[PDB]
């Protein structure tokens, strides 16, 4: 039982160590997507304002 | 003073008048149509060369360049007093109910300055709605400013109709309803509903719906407000002001903005958003002379509360009912956000120490549930502690007991509506926090009135 | 004022000098017979939008006033014909012989001209008719991504009006014409074409005709509404109509707003869909029911044009790809989809059996997602019930179910008559049950047909139990 | 001298003539309404109207004053409610004063200042301990709506009672009945008689919202340059920015990010730099600024927030998650900054606050282990027990500002471990009774902190707390 418990907790270290490394990989991918959308949103918003102003003049 | 049309650009019309004979800004100007009938337009901008740019209150189709335009010499004036009660109006204050003339004492202009700082006060007395989520977590005040925020199809109209059914039914004073840029079906539904219940006799109705051009939707709220302002100031009686939907005033202004010659602001809105909103909103208030309890539906475009229109509206309110789609998507109606909904009178001084403690207890349990949702979703339910598992169980029951069947929504719920007193509501959520209904299933709490009805419902399951 | 001259032209947008006293939004006729529409009355020139081919319209081309607004043919002659937004036939079966005409622009019925929506428009689809019911005079948006089953719902609805005395109008906007030809053939094969008008403004047409197509189809439906008859109109779709209006506005140099659309893009669809209504008994009691379409991009219901049309209509049917490919067809999202008429648009039998159905299944789908993260008895019973109810709401394309048969199927599953049946056998159980009820227990079905109410529940419970004795489950 | 109006609209008038007008000059229309020359163009003067414009027309005449905008200043404005022009709104008669100052005024230079060394006590334990504000500092209060921003400013103003500090609450874009509620709260807590209230409500013209902070700044500067100390609150600069945007867009100055002009940063930096701590040679007076920013959904990287964050000396970030949990005031200590830091604190607070910021950082960092109860080692066990107890001390009720001497003893007690024995739910009651015990019996320890600004004998203080701790009854 004690040896099986040692194997259980060791297996949980590895599995949750991988899940931590996988989470950091995904967190970077999401941060790239966010900053892609943030930059695209500001580019579009300001372009529509300037386009609207040029239509009057 | 007579003028001549030089341009027609959709809802905007440019009229050249004679030198030194210009209408003032906001003056009503009449134009006789070639087809037959009269078109009222409102003066907006003095362009120069004796030209006045005007926003039309009806369709400009059929107009021709060169037609005569006549200055009325004043703003759009509409009937006031007890002749308006029981009647249905349009933006110009004309009767659209097909029940003869309106023998009013006076006709006041729709434009008006806001009240003085000296005239104003705060709203401290609670107003019982009979809706659990509102009365507990974000209660309304008598003579105060209420706002019903929500996205497209989350439940603003169903909520305001329920507040008419609950509050305005046994109301000693008078009422005003303003239909602003919304569905004409709903105006017909509400009129016949008020006619059946007998509330129509206490209520003046105005309608300028989404079929109408922008100018009509821009000024229709002022027509209704002017009637409410009469009942506040001149007569000694309490007023209920229902507006559905106030957003459409801002949107109507946004439609005409570029044609008036104004450069656009952020998110496609007019640069004068805050000023135009404030000059309308600050008139909607209680004073030392009289009490107006204003309840306004507020559309949130794209479910985005950061949008300039609803964001700017928040400053004008004493209580806010914040509807969210994610609650409505589950079937939780009314879909009221228990955290983001707020009230100025949520404090021990007004509602008592028990009410405030129970209301705050509900918010902490629901806050903790939201923090755990993203953790539970990936890592699972059984990895939590015994305290958190109990919090999750009670939060889901609390969230379902916050739901409620409405009298006006029987055709959607498929069951009878329920009215729940405040002391009964506080008792119900208190017993759930203390843990007295932990063995009842979740569905027992869903769509009921009192906590007693939840105990009875659990036996059926 | 007598005759104008084209001073400049390009992209189907002429500019005319000479017409002094022309009306705002007036119909004009060019030299070669092609029509036009005068948009804005500026001081010097007049911006004219050409409603046809602009190959032979050069500089110096003569233009003349008609003294009228834009107008289309209407009536019984259009039934079973394929026309353009102007009313001209494309099927090649001779001219449209009719004396009745109606305008493109026409006001909606006011607050006193309407009666509350109280009469069903049966689609024959269980998911719609039970949870998101459409009534005569209602506007119900059909919204979702490409290839989610939007058109199929509209075509099946049209087919289900066979013998119900409801004139259908299918308005195609911006489609390829071979797909519209395929739709005409599908209506022909199911014998729905006799009472259907096919308006089409294909992708090769100028933008003004795409812009004008829903208003033409609306005018063809309004004819029957104001006569006291009932009509259904489908706009497939308004995304391409709005895009054609955007093109029109930008070519006329009107100021752009969000996604380059003009400021009155909400107003475009609001005045269109407000004309769909249920008239009062005082004004004849007729109706025009509207099925506008929106194509979302990647399920984005919160985009600019989708939320405008959601905010106009009396609810929406939202379809999704993940539901579609997982086996849920029709792929209706119960949480996002809603009907704003509701129980008023259902018969009393359907109202009683399916009154709380959408709210129950909304709670089920949340509970299903939460359950994945060993449950208790009462909660597990709700999941088992909901899972069986989901199988009942599944339905194949072009297989309409009469409302009486829908009531029995929904009554059976919601009162626990399929709890002892496995989940995989629920659809076969349904087909065999209804086949049993049609053959042997038709008086129970007929009670719902004639009265509109449920039969005696004692007798109905016994009839279902009688069927179950001859049902063999596979598991 | 004289000029005539060409065009009028939306609180803006373009004027022919006025050839020798100054940029920013005060103008008078023929009906008595005032204006300000913002745009000097080749053929006209763009004038922003400081009042109603319905009586202003084409042909209306405008006069030069030859002066910039001034406001009344001094002791007469104390206890009064005024608009940005200095006109009384409370209905309590005129404002008798000989002293006047310009709205636009240059800030003190680099050589006119002395380092910020004097505390401005807010009376709020979380702010005074870990995000300390000094006299002359500009500290931003930033967060979403209903996070407790206004309360912090009102409680700061109330705490200045009997400290010889003139407060100035500038309200921009608020509902006027909400401003009436604020002055009543100040009246009830005896805070109004040393406070000036400048209000430009939402119904006021856009130029008054634009000019409101500068008017309030000038009123604060009067006391600064006379050798006294003052506090100014701008509630808020988001609505001020939007009001200046309105005028710039109406005057057709080019738009940028969120439609703001290129001088909106310059607008706020010119305002906030006028708040300062003067040198001994210049009298030693000061103006402390508390600008507000209302963020939308926590977006601190939005344009106007980004501007005011970089301009100021520090930020007090508030958050909704903390507010709903019961952490009130809802101050996020991790991201909140005070660049002045220890220099703005007395020696007693500086010493005790070092352990407090260390303990609170480690608690919220190691909060993932909190659910895993009694599995942890004793090192992280005691830090979680200490951490959750310090959170309860940092909680504080509405309108109850604490004296600095009472704050340091409360922080000293929790950080040295005198509340580890007492339960978590009893920490706030333990605090209130401890300070009641210290005020009554052990006043000599309190008075030492008042006089010297340092901690008393630590072993004597430890003995005083232990006497109370035995008399206390847990639950
Ligand atoms: N309290 C409620 N109970 C049951 N269903 C509701 C409730 N509120 C809204 N709904 C559902 O959502 C639909 C939209 O409500 P509505 O008030 O028209 O939304 P909006 O916020 O756009 O005004 C209703 O027709 C109904 O089907
Ligand atoms: N209930 C259904 N069962 C099976 N297939 C369906 C069903 N509804 C639609 N489909 C299929 O989905 C595809 C797309 O249908 P369509 O109505 O053209 O979607 P959309 O108009 O949204 O692009 C078609 O091939 C059609 O056969
Ligand atoms: N420390 C506190 N304890 C309890 N309630 C508070 C506290 N601080 C603020 N509140 C309450 O919470 C609400 C927060 O709103 P407010 O102070 O106006 O902040 P904001 O200006 O950001 O909206 C107020 O109604 C106030 O009564
Ligand atoms: Mg609504
Ligand atoms: Mg399709
Ligand atoms: Mg505030």
- Please provide the size of chain B in residues: 461
Options B156, B248, B394, B400, the catalytic residue: B156
Both B352 and B322 in one domain: the answer is no
The one-character DSSP state at D84 is: T
Both B106 and B133 in one domain: the answer is yes
Burial of C146 (0-12, 13-18, 19+ CB in 10 A): exposed
Q: Which of B309, B344, B379 is the last residue of a domain?
A: B344
- Which is nearest to C91 in space by CA: C211, C213, C185? C185
- Which is nearest to B429 in space by CA: B336, B366, B371? B366
Q: Which ligand is nearest to the CA of B152?
A: 1
Both B196 and B301 in one domain: the answer is yes
C397 lines ligand 2 (CB under 6 A): yes
Tell me whether B346 touches chain D (CB under 8 Å).
no
Report angle CA A22, A23, A28 to the nearest 5 degrees.
100
Q: State CA B68 to chain mean position distance.
A: 39
Instruction: Report residue B146: phi and psi, to 5°.
Output: -105, 140
Both B112 and B184 in one domain: the answer is yes
In order of their start, the domains of chain D are 1-67 (2.40.30.20), 68-345 (3.40.50.300), 346-471 (1.20.150.20)
Both B373 and B322 in one domain: the answer is no
Q: Which of B54, B75, B96 is the last residue of a domain?
A: B75
The one-character DSSP state at B165 is: I
- Which is nearest to B175 in space by CA: B190, B188, B185, B189? B190
- Which is nearest to B161 in space by CA: B197, B127, B126, B135? B197
Q: How far is the CA of B243 from the centre of ligand 3 (A)?
A: 28
- CB within 8 A of C411, min separation 6: which ones? C353, C454, C460
> Would you tell me the crossing angle of helices B273-281 and B247-257 to the nearest 10 degrees?
140
Both B339 and B368 in one domain: the answer is no
How many other CB atoms are there within 10 angstroms of residue C443's CB atom?
11
Smallest Cα distance from C145 to chain A, Å? 21
Smallest Cα distance from A57 to chain D, Å? 10
B331 lines ligand 1 (CB under 6 A): no
Q: Which ligand is nearest to the CA of C340?
A: 1
The answer to whether residues C213 and C142 touch, using CB atoms and an 8 Å cutoff, is no
CA atoms of D423 and D404, how far apart (whole Å): 25
How many other CB atoms are there within 10 angstroms of residue C469's CB atom?
6
How many residue pairs from chains A and D have C-beta atoms closer than 8 A?
12
Question: Within 13 Å of residue C208, how many CA atoms lie on the same side as its CB?
Answer: 21
Options B42, B162, B182, B255, the catalytic residue: B182
CB–CB contact C277 B267 (8 Å): no
The continuous run of DSSP H or E covering D231 comes out as strand D229-235
Tell me whether A51 touches chain B (CB under 8 Å).
no
Choose among B62, B191, B377: nearest Cβ to C24: B62
The continuous run of DSSP H or E covering D337 comes out as strand D337-338
Both B227 and B353 in one domain: the answer is no
| Residue B154: strand, helix, or coil | coil
B37 lines ligand 1 (CB under 6 A): no
Burial of D273 (0-12, 13-18, 19+ CB in 10 A): middle
| Residue C234: strand, helix, or coil | strand
Give per-residue burial for C275-304: e unless 16+ CB within 10 Å, then b. bbbbbbeebebbbbbbbbbbbbeebebbbb
CA atoms of B165 and B190, how far apart (whole Å): 10
Nearest CA in chain C to B34: C23
CA atoms of C382 and B443, how far apart (whole Å): 9
DSSP per position, D308-331: HHHHSSEEEEB-HHHHHHT-SS-B
Resolution limit, Å: 2.6
Choose among C114, C310, C381: nearest Cβ to B188: C114
Both B54 and B142 in one domain: the answer is no
Q: Which of B51, B75, B99 is the last residue of a domain?
A: B75
Walk across the sheet containing C338-339 and list its strands. C82-83, C196-201, C166-173, C230-236, C287-295, C141-144, C315-319, C338-339
Q: How far is the CA of C152 from the centre of ligand 6 (A)?
A: 52
The continuous run of DSSP H or E covering B240 comes out as strand B239-244
CA atoms of B310 and B323, how far apart (whole Å): 12
Both B420 and B435 in one domain: the answer is yes
D459 lines ligand 3 (CB under 6 A): no
DSSP per position, C113-125: TB----SB---S-
C149 lines ligand 2 (CB under 6 A): yes
CB–CB contact D175 B145 (8 Å): yes
- Counting from 1 in the atom list of ligand 3, the atom nearest the Cα of D235 is 21
Question: Within 13 Å of residue B315, how many CA atoms lie on the same side as its CB?
Answer: 28
> Would you tell me the crossing angle of helices D427-440 and D458-471 to the nearest 10 degrees?
120
Q: How was this entry determined?
A: X-ray
Both B138 and B235 in one domain: the answer is yes
CA atoms of D337 and C456, how far apart (whole Å): 74
Q: How far is the CA of C148 from the centre of ligand 2 (A)?
A: 6
The one-character DSSP state at D21 is: P
Both B149 and B287 in one domain: the answer is yes
How many residue pairs from chains B and C have C-beta atoms closer than 8 A?
179
Which residues make beta-bridge pairs with B149? B298, B322
> Which of left, alpha, beta for C286 (phi over 0: left; psi -120 to 50: alpha)?
beta
- The gap between the terminal CA atoms of chain D, to the nearest Å, is 80
| Residue B421's CATH number | 1.10.1140.10
Query: Which residues form the domain of B34?
Result: 1-75
| Residue B214's CATH number | 3.40.50.300
Q: Among C183, C397, C399, which residue has the most ligand 2 atoms within 8 Å of its CB, making it the best to mutate?
A: C397
Which residues make beta-bridge pairs with C47? C15
How many other CB atoms are there within 10 angstroms of residue C470's CB atom?
8
- Which is nearest to C356 in space by CA: C305, C291, C415? C415
Q: Among B149, B151, B158, B160, which residue has the most ligand 1 atoms within 8 Å of its CB, making it the best to mutate?
A: B158
Number of structural domains (chain B) is: 3
Is B423 catalytic? The answer is no
> Which of left, alpha, beta for C298 (phi over 0: left; psi -120 to 50: alpha)?
left
Q: How far is CA D447 from CA B151, B247, D457, D465, in A?
A: 58, 58, 12, 16
Both B8 and B19 in one domain: the answer is yes
Q: How far is CA B193 from CA B404, C414, D55, in A?
A: 21, 32, 44
β-strand D70-72 against D100-102: which pairing, if any?
A: antiparallel
Q: Where are the alpha helices (DSSP H) in B318-352?
A: 325-330, 348-351
How many other CB atoms are there within 10 angstroms of residue B425's CB atom?
28
The one-character DSSP state at D370 is: S
> Would you tell me the crossing angle of helices D264-272 and D303-311 to the nearest 10 degrees?
30
Numbered residues of the known binding site of D for ATP: 143-150
| Residue B29's CATH number | 2.40.10.170
The answer to whether residues C354 and C412 touch, using CB atoms and an 8 Å cutoff, is no
The continuous run of DSSP H or E covering B13 comes out as strand B12-17
The answer to whether residues C161 and C195 touch, using CB atoms and an 8 Å cutoff, is yes
Smallest Cα distance from C306 to chain A, Å? 19
Report angle CA C39, C45, C50 to the nearest 5 degrees.
45
| Residue B304: strand, helix, or coil | coil
Handedness of CA C306, C311, C314, C319 (dihedral sign): positive
Is the peptide bond prior to D208 cis by the omega test (within 30 degrees of 0)? no
């Amino acid at each position: 039982l004690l040896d099986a418990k040692a194997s259980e907790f060791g297996a949980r270290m590895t599995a949750m160590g991988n899940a931590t490394d996988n989470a950091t990989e995904m967190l970077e991918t999401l941060t790239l997507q966010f900053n892609r959308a943030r930059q695209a949103a500001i580019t579009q918003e300001i372009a529509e304002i300037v386009a609207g102003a040029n239509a009057l003049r | 003073n007579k003028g001549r049309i030089i341009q027609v650009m959709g809802p905007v019309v440019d009229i050249q008048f004679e030198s030194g004979q210009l209408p003032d800004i906001y003056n009503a100007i009449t134009i006789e149509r070639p087809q037959g009938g009269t078109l009222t337009v409102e003066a907006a901008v003095h362009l120069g060369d004796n030209v006045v740019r005007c926003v039309a209150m009806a369709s400009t189709d059929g107009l021709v360049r060169g037609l005569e335009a006549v200055d009325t010499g004043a703003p759009i004036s509409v009937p006031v007093g007890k002749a308006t009660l029981g009647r249905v109006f349009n933006v110009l204050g004309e009767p659209i109910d097909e029940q003869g003339e309106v023998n009013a004492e006076e006709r006041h202009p729709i434009h008006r300055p806001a009240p003085e700082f000296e005239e104003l006060s705060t709203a401290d007395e609670i107003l019982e709605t009979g809706i659990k989520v509102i009365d507990l977590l974000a209660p309304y005040a008598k003579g105060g400013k209420i706002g019903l925020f929500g996205g497209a199809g989350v439940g603003k109209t169903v909520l305001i109709q329920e507040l008419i059914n609950n509050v305005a039914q046994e109301h000693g004073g008078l009422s005003v309803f303003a239909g602003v840029g919304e569905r004409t079906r709903e105006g017909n539904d509400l009129y016949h509903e008020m006619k059946d219940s007998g509330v129509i006799s206490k209520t003046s109705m105005v309608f300028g719906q989404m079929n109408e051009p922008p100018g009509a939707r821009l000024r229709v709220a002022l027509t209704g407000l002017t009637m409410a302002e009469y009942f506040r100031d001149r007569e000694g009686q309490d007023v209920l002001l229902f507006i559905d939907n106030i957003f459409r005033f801002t949107q109507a202004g946004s439609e005409v903005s570029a044609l008036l010659g104004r450069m656009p602001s952020a998110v496609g809105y007019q640069p004068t958003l805050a000023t135009e909103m404030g000059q309308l909103q600050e008139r909607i208030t209680s004073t030392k002379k009289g009490s107006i309890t204003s309840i306004q539906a507020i559309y949130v475009p794209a479910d985005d509360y950061t949008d300039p229109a609803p964001a700017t509206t928040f400053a004008h309110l004493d209580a806010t009912t914040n509807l969210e789609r994610k609650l409505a998507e589950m079937g939780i109606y009314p879909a009221v956000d228990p955290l983001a909904s707020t009230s100025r009178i949520l404090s021990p001084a007004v509602v008592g120490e028990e009410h405030y403690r129970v209301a705050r207890g509900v918010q902490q349990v629901l806050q903790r549930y939201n923090d755990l949702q993203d953790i539970i979703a990936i890592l699972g339910m059984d990895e939590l502690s015994d305290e958190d598992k109990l919090i999750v169980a009670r939060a889901r029951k609390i969230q379902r007991f916050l739901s409620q069947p409405f009298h006006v929504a029987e055709q959607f719920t498929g069951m009878p509506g329920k009215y729940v007193p405040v002391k009964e509501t506080v008792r119900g959520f208190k017993e759930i926090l203390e843990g007295k209904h932990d063995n009842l299933p979740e569905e027992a709490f869903y769509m009921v009135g009192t906590i007693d009805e939840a105990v009875e419902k659990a036996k059926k399951l | 004022v007598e005759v104008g001259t084209v001073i400049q032209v390009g992209d189907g947008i002429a500019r005319v000098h000479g017409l002094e006293k022309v009306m705002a939004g007036e119909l004009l006729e060019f030299e070669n017979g092609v029509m036009g529409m005068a948009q804005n009355l500026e001081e010097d020139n007049v911006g004219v939008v050409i409603l046809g081919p602009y190959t032979e319209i050069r500089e110096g081309t003569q233009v003349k006033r008609t003294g009228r607004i834009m107008e289309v043919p209407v009536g019984e002659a259009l039934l079973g014909r394929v026309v353009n937004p102007l009313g001209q036939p494309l099927d090649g079966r001779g001219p449209i012989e009719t004396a009745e005409y109606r305008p493109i622009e026409s006001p909606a019925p006011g607050v006193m001209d309407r009666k509350s929506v109280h009469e069903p428009l049966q689609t024959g689809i269980k998911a719609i008719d039970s949870m998101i019911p459409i009534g005569r005079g209602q506007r119900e948006l059909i919204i979702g991504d490409r290839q989610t089953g939007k058109t199929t719902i509209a075509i099946d609805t049209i087919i289900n009006q066979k013998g119900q005395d409801v004139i259908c109008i299918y308005v195609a906007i911006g489609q390829k014409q071979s797909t519209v030809a395929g739709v005409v053939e599908t209506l022909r094969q199911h014998d729905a074409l006799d009472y259907t008008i096919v308006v089409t403004a294909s992708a090769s047409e100028p933008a003004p005709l795409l812009y004008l197509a829903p208003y033409a189809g609306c005018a063809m439906g309004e004819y029957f509404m104001y006569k006291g008859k009932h009509a259904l109109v489908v706009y497939d779709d308004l995304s391409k109509q709005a895009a054609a209006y955007r093109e029109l506005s930008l070519l006329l140099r009107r100021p752009p707003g969000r996604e380059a659309y003009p400021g009155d893009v909400f107003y475009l669809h609001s005045r269109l869909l407000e004309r769909a209504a249920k008239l009062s008994d005082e004004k004849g009691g007729g109706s025009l029911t509207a099925l506008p379409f929106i194509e979302t991009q990647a399920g984005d219901v919160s985009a600019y044009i989708p939320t405008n049309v959601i905010s106009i209509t009396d609810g929406q049917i939202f379809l999704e790809s993940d539901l579609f490919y997982s086996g849920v067809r029709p792929a209706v999202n119960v949480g996002i989809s809603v009907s704003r008429v509701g129980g008023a648009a259902q018969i009393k039998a359907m109202k009683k059996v399916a009154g709380t159905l959408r709210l129950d299944l909304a709670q089920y789908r949340e509970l299903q997602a939460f359950a994945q993260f060993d449950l208790d008895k009462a909660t597990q019973a709700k999941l088992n019930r909901g899972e069986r109810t989901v199988e009942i709401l599944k339905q194949d394309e072009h297989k309409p179910m009469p409302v009486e048969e829908q009531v029995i199927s929904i009554y059976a599953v919601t009162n626990g008559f399929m709890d002892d049946i496995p989940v995989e056998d629920v659809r076969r159980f349904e087909e065999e049950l209804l086949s049993f009820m049609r053959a042997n227990k038709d008086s129970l079905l007929d009670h719902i047909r004639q009265t509109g109410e449920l039969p005696d529940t004692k007798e109905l419970d016994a009839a279902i139990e009688e069927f179950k004795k001859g049902f063999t489950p596979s598991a």
